[PDB]
Ligand binder design. Structure first.
Ligand SMILES: [U]
Ligand SMILES: [U]
Length: 517
């Protein structure tokens, strides 16, 4: 943390944050969501970390270089340690990325090493090559070298993500799937796990062995698992929470903005809210059905009438303001909603659905007052504009993510937030073999467009290919884009260091501090 000369700090440097839901896991190789990564940044530290404005900065790696953007050399700081006092070496990075790549780990982010184009990942992922073949190597204890199959200019931006953080082999090999329990876990970030009571709290305390420990201010942070955005806010107002999770209740927001204007933080956010369609299951394997649902949803009602928190109506998957995106607005988004409804109705008639034998299906969401309210509104809009009958289902966060990966659904509420600020952070998730493809979408034409982005000379050409890849995805109606998110959350006035300027929201509790109040 960089406390402003002049500010006085409080005596007790404790922080309470809501975290949206109970994490899937604390193992960096088993996580995929925002709740999981909020915890993961305070516990595990990879090669690079984000600074308070979101820029890639020194993490375990104090300095690095690249050869033709294809060979990256990371110089690890000589004092990096694990919470047990042991040294963090380039060998821990070797072992960890091999464990991420191994199909036996089953990581939802195994494909992050494919996004980075590390040599040999595809065969390793396919089980054709053993994980020991991965293009990484410890040149010496403090020198980690990565070799990629194509130049990847933004390679370093990928590295602040939890799946490329190191995991402690001794703990992992001795305790198996119990390595993350408090009595067993070994960590390397600014904090260490003090307590974890399922569905109640996660308590982290300062990790004295952190290399940047003199700059850590907050001695303890608790993360709550509250999925009701109403209860999160209520507990914030009662004084129990200093930082709400960043999902705001529709019910109370207008009230909050007028009653405590300066605690309502509302900042840019590279996330997209959409309805995920299970592309591999009839009748969702018919593009006419997918397109009719995409066109019949009325985003203006959703964004401006039901929610009205500053979200922008969406027509793509990658947010148009991502760095390096220059997207082509599609024709259907230029029409009036009435015309969208008429085309939508024709498309479903063509697919054979009647007013008397309508298309019916489940609309699944992760338990939440926000998502429930939006899904009730969406079901009514679709009923009214297209004649579809939807049945709402809700699942708890962890269960919900497992359903999506397994394909045990029809249509699901969804949100993807960038892992790095560059369009392939969104576009790589729709690749046929990506481990993050819960759309179950497979388009050889889309895969090629993305693969050609690593084979071209200039950024102009890359940017045009990302626009064509968004167009192919829209033409296939793989999803129903709804809105681009704003990052909206309540932060008490004594919480310092939360600037709201990082469009990925990669908050580190070591960078925050309690102002005396
Ligand atoms: U437009
Ligand atoms: U269903």
């Amino acid at each position: 943390a960089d406390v402003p000369a002049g500010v006085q700090l409080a005596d007790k440097q404790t922080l309470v944050r809501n975290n949206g839901s109970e994490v899937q896991s604390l193992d960096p190789h088993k996580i995929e969501g925002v709740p999981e990564s909020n915890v993961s940044r305070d516990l595990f530290e990879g090669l690079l970390i984000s600074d308070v404005e979101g820029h890639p900065s020194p993490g375990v790696a104090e300095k690095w270089e690249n050869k033709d953007f294809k060979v990256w050399t990371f110089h690890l700081r000589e004092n990096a340690k694990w919470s047990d006092g042991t040294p963090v070496t380039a060998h821990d990075f070797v072992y960890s990325w091999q464990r991420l790549a191994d199909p036996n780990t089953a990581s939802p982010y195994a494909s992050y090493l494919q996004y980075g184009h590390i040599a040999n990942i595809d065969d390793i992922i396919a089980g054709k090559k053993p994980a020991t073949d991965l293009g990484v190597k410890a040149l010496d204890d403090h020198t980690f070298e990565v070799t990629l199959s194509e130049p990847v200019p933004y390679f370093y931006k990928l590295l602040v993500h939890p799946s490329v953080s190191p995991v402690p082999k001794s703990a992992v090999e001795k305790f198996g799937d119990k390595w993350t329990q408090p009595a067993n876990i070994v960590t390397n970030g600014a904090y260490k796990l003090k307590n974890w009571v399922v569905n109640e709290r996660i308590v982290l305390e300062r990790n004295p062995q952190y290399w940047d420990n003199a700059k850590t201010v907050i001695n303890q942070v608790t993360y709550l698992p509250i999925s009701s955005e109403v209860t999160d806010v209520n507990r914030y107002r009662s004084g129990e929470i200093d930082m709400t999770y960043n999902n705001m209740p529709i019910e109370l927001f207008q009230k909050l903005k007028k009653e405590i204007p300066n605690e309502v933080r509302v900042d840019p956010y590279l996330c997209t809210y959409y309805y995920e369609i299970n592309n591999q299951k009839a009748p969702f394997n018919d593009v006419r059905v997918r397109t009719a649902l995409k066109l019949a949803l009325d985003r203006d009602i959703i964004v401006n009438k039901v929610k009205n928190q500053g979200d922008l109506p969406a027509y793509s998957y990658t947010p148009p303001y991502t760095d390096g995106a220059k997207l082509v607005e599609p024709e259907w988004f230029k029409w009036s909603q009435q015309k969208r409804n008429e085309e939508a109705k024709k498309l479903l008639a063509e697919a054979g659905f009647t007013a008397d034998k309508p298309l019916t299906f489940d609309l699944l969401y992760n338990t939440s007052d926000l998502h429930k309210k939006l899904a009730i509104a969406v079901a009514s809009i679709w009923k009214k504009n297209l004649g579809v009958n939807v049945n709402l289902e809700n699942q708890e966060w962890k269960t919900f993510l497992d359903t999506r990966h397994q394909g045990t659904f029809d249509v699901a509420r969804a949100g993807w937030c960038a892992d790095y600020n560059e369009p392939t952070s969104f576009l790589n998730t729709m690749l046929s073999d990506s481990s993050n493809n819960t759309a179950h979408y497979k388009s050889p034409a889309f895969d090629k467009l993305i693969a050609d982005t690593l084979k071209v000379a200039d950024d102009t050409q890359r940017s045009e290919l990302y626009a064509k890849a968004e167009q192919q995805l829209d033409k296939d109606s793989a999803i129903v884009p709804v809105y681009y998110y704003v990052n909206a959350r309540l932060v008490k006035p004594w919480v310092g260091g939360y600037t709201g300027k990082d469009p990925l929201d990669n908050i580190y509790v070591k960078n925050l501090y309690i102002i005396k109040h």
